[PDB]
């Protein structure tokens, strides 16, 4: 989850999120440098009493200021598209889990073997247990095995929603009549939080996602206990 | 039929200061007043309808 006064991304939970952090670092250096250079050049143009107000020839300089940006865009696009096609590559999941968005809660279906399904609602503020997080906790967490490739399938039974977990690099819209696929792999155990990410009405702010990542043997026993 | 365009050219070029939408004569004034009365009356009715629809 996010922490107070946070400036950047949540720490990466998945290898793809790690990749996104290094790509963001590369891109932001470029944004910083260009922003700075424009501000600097503004200040340079504005700090002399020397003048030159006759017609100035443009063609030589326009070569520089098309070619250099084209090269910079290629240096962004190359690693950008490498990550795009890395996520898309065939991975062989161990487990498929469905999530269905509703106004205003998530349901989860684990139907590889048994018909396991349940609803996941925000814990009201007045019912939080000491130490628990306002607007983020749910009654029934999405328990998943750590260090395993999981296929998540996302849809809705009413309006649009969007299933997001920032620390895993995940955001997939939940569209009725459509079954959208994404892959989830956690490098670590723990609790990973997200929030509905398509405006779905009055309680859009209040239908969070909590993943609980545990060893396979714990997941298997939890699965059995939830039938 | 006969070509009466010259007679309409004379009427619509008469130096009487009338704007083109009234230059045909008394019938233009009536059709203008009908149009503007329905527009302004209908607009007041539309505001009444909003007032009504703004409450349960």
């Amino acid at each position: 989850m996010a922490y107070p006064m946070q400036l950047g991304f949540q720490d990466a939970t998945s290898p793809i999120m790690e990749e996104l952090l290094h790509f963001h670092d590369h891109t932001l250096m470029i944004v910083f440098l260009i922003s700075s250079l424009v501000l600097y050049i503004i200040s340079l143009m504005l700090t002399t009493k020397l003048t030159h107000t006759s017609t100035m020839d443009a063609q030589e300089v326009e070569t520089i200021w098309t070619i250099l940006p084209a090269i910079i865009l290629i240096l962004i696009a190359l690693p950008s598209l490498r990550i795009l096609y890395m996520m898309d590559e065939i991975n062989n999941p161990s487990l498929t889990v469905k999530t269905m968005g509703h106004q205003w809660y998530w349901s989860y279906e684990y139907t590889d073997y048994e018909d396991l399904s349940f609803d996941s609602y925000m814990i009201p503020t007045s019912e939080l247990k000491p130490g628990e997080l306002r607007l983020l906790e749910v009654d029934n967490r999405v328990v998943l095995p750590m260090e395993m490739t999981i296929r998540m399938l996302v849809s809705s039974e009413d309006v649009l929603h969007s299933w997001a977990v920032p620390s895993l690099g995940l955001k997939t819209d939940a569209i009725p009549g459509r079954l959208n696929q994404t892959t989830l792999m956690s490098s670590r155990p723990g609790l990973y939080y997200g929030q509905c990410s398509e405006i779905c009405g009055s309680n859009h702010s209040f239908m969070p996602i909590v993943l609980e990542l545990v060893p396979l043997k714990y997941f298997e026993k939890w699965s059995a206990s939830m039938l | 039929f006969e070509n009466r365009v010259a007679e309409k050219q004379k009427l619509f070029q008469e130096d009487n200061g009338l704007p083109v939408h009234l230059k045909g004569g008394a019938t233009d004034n009536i059709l203008y007043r009908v149009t503007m009365t329905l527009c302004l009356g209908g607009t007041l009715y539309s505001l009444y309808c909003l007032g009504w629809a703004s409450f349960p």
Binding site: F9, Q10, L28, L46, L73, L84, M87, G201 | -
Partner: protein, 513 residues
Amino acid sequence: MFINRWLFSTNHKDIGTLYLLFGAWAGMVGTALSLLIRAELGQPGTLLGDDQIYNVVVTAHAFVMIFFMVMPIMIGGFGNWLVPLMIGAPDMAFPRMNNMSFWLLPPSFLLLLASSMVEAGAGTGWTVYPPLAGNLAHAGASVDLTIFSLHLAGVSSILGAINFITTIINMKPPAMSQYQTPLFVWSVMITAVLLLLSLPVLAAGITMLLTDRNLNTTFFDPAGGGDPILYQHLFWFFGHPEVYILILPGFGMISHIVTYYSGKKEPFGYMGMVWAMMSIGFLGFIVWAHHMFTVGMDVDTRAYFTSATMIIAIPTGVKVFSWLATLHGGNIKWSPAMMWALGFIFLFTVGGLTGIVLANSSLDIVLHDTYYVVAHFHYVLSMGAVFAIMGGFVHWFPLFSGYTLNDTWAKIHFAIMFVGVNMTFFPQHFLGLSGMPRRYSDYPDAYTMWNTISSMGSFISLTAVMLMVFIIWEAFASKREVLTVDLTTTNLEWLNGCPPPYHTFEEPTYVNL
């Protein structure tokens, strides 16, 4: 005489004045809505106790700022006042149709404020996506009133586009080629072409939404074989062109302002500026699905939209560097208008660069539907459009009115607004990177510090807006009449005096070959 002049106008200047008054009033509405947003977000917990009302406020904020403030001011106001004067034309091509483009806007606005007053409002976002905007999740008249608002705004701008394209093509002096028209006139022509092509697609899509809500069609309803994603494609096919429509006249005004206050006869690289605006207009039609990177589209489609989107930076950079090259060697006059334009160049550049971050679909997965997007467009659109409007307004106020502003007050106004908008929007980058969703009435406690600072910034900009009203009053209260204006040889709109007579160019300009 008053009704004949102000309700029955066929005069480009008076219609322009009507648009500026309308847009200024709309900006107060849109500003009040923005302050309600930030008052809710300024402390964790609930203020309004009704998140449907929060969603209505956000939706109305966007529609008012886009359709009733920026487009009427830039195109209706500056376009009507300046375009005929800059080409020596005696009016617009269709001077009576021009008046109907204006008078469609008060009714459009009335339908939007009816949408908010009936039932529970349209709490949809300005995108109005189904099924949230459909007849189950938004039962009753609110969304239909919003759709009709957009229909009347659309007709207004389509007929206005026809008017400006025809005027600009057909009503220049016979010796004047397209390559001897001022950059502002180019900016309006290109904006008008984008309006002509994009708004009919929006009209088709919101019409489909209307029939799904009222005539039992199923364009967007999977139960009938429809698809909510089809609505998104039609909306954004309009919506990306729309964001370039909102900035292009601003680019035109910035070119004139930077040229003027640099003491130059001409912008640097005229033909490059023309090329850049036409390239931006063209590319603006082939990038829309960067608004849809999370909907489930194919990897190759994501790769295409990422790449095509990034291409826009090349012509845009040519414009930024050409503005800097216009300053280069200038006898710089530090007028309030110049300050607005310099603020524009910097803040636009920041927002454009966060756009290039978003263009990368891999990073957009994590940034989509977060405050990072809100930060991006309040830099490029919100601050870019507003800074260009304020620069144009203070530059041309003495032309339109015949009176001068107090330059010291106008510089005070600029300074407060620059502080306020940066304090408001810069921290929203941090909120977005750290995962705060947009369109939220309340937030996890971690996000409190940046939301608190952002809301405090929104109050600084309110102080700037109140001072702007006072500054306009003081100008009309004091009645300092214009005597002389520099650089009329390369700024034709000034050459008929301040204000120009009701009829200008009754005898056209003489231009030989």
